[PDB]
Write a protein that binds this ligand. Structure first.
Ligand SMILES: Cc1ncc(COP(=O)(O)O)c(CN[C@H](C(=O)O)[C@H](C)O)c1O
Ligand SMILES: Cc1ncc(COP(=O)(O)O)c(CN[C@H](C(=O)O)[C@H](C)O)c1O
Lengths: 405, 405
């Protein structure tokens, strides 16, 4: 940076603290990642200056010839990445991507079937304090109380009982592969649309390490910033038959001017994901998660679903008689970033929880491998089995520093 | 840029075209501006990597200490700028800022009174193809057919007849000062909330060149990217009594993770607006608009409302027997960017229009003054009075090039 340090010392000082923090900590928040310098440069471009309501070649402002090239690059690269017939790269966020799909196919008060929020479902999949739960009538399917795998007979029964217009599959805290074929089979039985929110697993899907929802879902939504390792934002994929309606839902439906600089950054991220080394990266993400899972079980930890098929895992802390909140707080003291997270059938409130959610996407981006996974698990064991020992916590602190340099 | 040219030649080439285009054209789109290099650097920062749902000191993720400083800087600087009791700097856009206010005070189907869309009202002020018009029952007030000034007796009559729960004031194409006191007086008469959407005039308000809606409105919404000359995004200002509800509407109501890098850029832009030279800039914007208005009238053009009090003007092209669409197209041929725009009581469809909308914020940022305003008006006259003359258009093309270098 050249101009920000001179123009705004206060903002620059805070940014520099944040940059240094990102390097110093072991970042295990499952939704986080580190974008490339190319992605950030695209976000820091003059494209922020351009109003471009509408779509490439169909804008409501003149002078969009070049931002059109950018948006089209993003759309085409996304279509190659996921094998989708249509892409909308304009959603400002995962929230807005989901909002737009709901706006497309639902009327106020329509019934929607989504994953139980306390079992892994997202806020935008029917929370009564979110637009989704306020605007539509959400019902929920659950995971099995023992296996913690989605109960597809429960999805089916809820769908047949409640007759939703839309079924939502996908999650913010589900560590196993989702069977999109079964979701579409159930949707077909009850005459419902199927929406898949692949936000967490999008990079894995792109790398062929999770089944692709595109051939099964009428609509696929996602963020660009989780396993896909792109800028912060959303995207919708859909069959050509829904393209016009989806585009109209985004604009003029729920947004105005798109963030063209962020769309440029999306294109860059998609370009990166199309490369062979991204496929290798994504495999290391999953390999690392499985290794981390195994190493945690070696420490004596119980994992929700007994492990992981993806980038993320959920520790059920009840055997250690710890809450997620306690674990999150103490791990913060030693430089390990996790979040407290409700586990399926959690006896604790969402403000307290019995679990922590952990993901490997960020640490993998930094170059961490299997040996680092073993060490991270050993540090977590040291901390959570010795929460009352300042000497243990100082050792953990030193071992975290050794990992991050 | 260092890494983008190497990583993504396609995206870089398009961005470079866009950068050069922004320099070459006379940019008169009233909603556009050119942000500082400091603003862009903040947007191009590692802050994109951070999930920070919630608010400063009240986040749902650990490690937000530094992004908290950034967001708080943005909020406090906004409060100083506008004299507001509370700021929410998280809205992804003007669309989302408006959406959140509606979500706060309205239920599905509630009546809202906004400015007639064909008289200057925005898409998000009740368009039947926008969430606003689909979700709520919008009614409209108009401007006087002769003066083109908001008819406050019409605002009052519509409010008394329809009994809206909310009245919206402010516009995307209104060239005169809005009387917020009268809007609040009417709101008070009928027991309605008052929302002011100051998106277009926010920089002028910040510089004391337009009356401040803050003391009159329950909610003030705005974009950060028009006259305020900041990054692309939204903001809500409100009285302390509504702070909790507004914050909850943004999250968990209608958004998820905020764009912390964009919020950093907001803070920078607000820092700039707090400086004396921004006040001088904003005065030149208004001075230039008045000069441009006068010079266009000198060319024989009729202006909606007979001129301007702000940054923007609307040419009524009926005397020249031209549509806005024709004017927009031919001006594009010579390197002058405007938009076609419906005028009040327009006999043409919104796809055709009888007007063009012009604003001076962008050209003023580039250093253009009164002499440049005279020349821009003379070029517009040359073009629009000689649409069939390729020699006139080539002269205009050369005169535009002379202005931009
Ligand atoms: C599955 C899923 N869909 C949408 C979103 C929201 O995206 P955005 O924040 O851009 O609006 C999420 C967000 N996930 C967060 C996380 O996993 O940490 C949190 C649960 O909201 C999501 O997971
Ligand atoms: C008065 C007003 N409010 C909201 C918006 C939408 O902001 P965003 O594009 O960030 O969602 C606008 C947008 N204005 C555009 C323009 O003036 O060119 C256009 C009319 O939508 C606005 O003017």
């Amino acid at each position: 940076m050249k101009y920000l340090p001179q123009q705004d010392p206060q903002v620059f000082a805070a940014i520099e603290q944040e940059r240094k923090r990102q390097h110093a900590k072991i970042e295990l928040i499952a939704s986080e990642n580190f974008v490339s310098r190319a992605v950030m440069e695209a976000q820091g471009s003059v494209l922020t200056n351009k109003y471009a309501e509408g779509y490439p070649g169909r804008r409501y402002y003149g002078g969009c010839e070049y931002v059109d090239i950018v948006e089209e690059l993003a759309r085409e690269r996304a279509k190659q990445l996921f094998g989708a017939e249509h892409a909308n790269v304009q959603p400002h966020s995962g929230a807005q991507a989901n909002m737009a799909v709901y706006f497309t196919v639902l009327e106020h008060g329509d019934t929607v079937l989504g994953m139980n929020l306390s079992h892994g479902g997202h806020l935008t999949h029917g929370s009564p304090v979110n637009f989704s739960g306020v605007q539509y009538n959400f019902v929920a399917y659950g995971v099995d109380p023992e296996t913690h795998v989605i109960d597809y007979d429960d999805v089916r029964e809820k769908a047949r009982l409640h007759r939703p217009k839309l079924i939502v599959a996908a999650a913010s805290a589900y560590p196993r592969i989702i069977d999109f074929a079964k979701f579409r089979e159930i949707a077909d039985e009850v005459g419902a649309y199927l929406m898949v929110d692949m936000a967490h697993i999008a990079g894995l899907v792109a790398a062929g390490l999770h089944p692709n929802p595109v051939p099964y879902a009428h609509f696929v939504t996602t963020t660009t910033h989780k396993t896909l390792r792109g800028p912060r934002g959303g995207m919708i994929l859909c069959q050509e038959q829904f393209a016009k309606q989806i585009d109209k839902a985004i604009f003029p439906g729920i947004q105005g001017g798109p963030l063209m600089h962020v769309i440029a950054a999306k294109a860059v991220a998609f370009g990166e994901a199309l490369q062979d080394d991204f496929k290798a990266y994504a495999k290391r993400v999953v390999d690392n998660a499985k290794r981390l899972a195994s190493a945690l079980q070696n420490e004596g930890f119980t994992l929700v679903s007994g492990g992981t098929d993806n980038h993320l895992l959920l520790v059920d802390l009840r055997p250690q008689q710890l809450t997620g909140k306690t674990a999150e707080k103490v791990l913060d003291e030693v430089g390990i970033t996790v979040n407290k997270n409700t586990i399926p059938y959690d006896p604790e409130s969402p403000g307290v929880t019995s679990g922590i959610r952990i993901g490997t996407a960020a640490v993998t981006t930094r170059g961490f491998g299997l040996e680092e996974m073993d060490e991270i698990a050993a540090i977590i064991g040291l901390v959570l089995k010795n929460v009352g020992s300042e000497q243990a916590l100082e050792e953990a602190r030193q071992r975290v520093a050794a990992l991050t340099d």
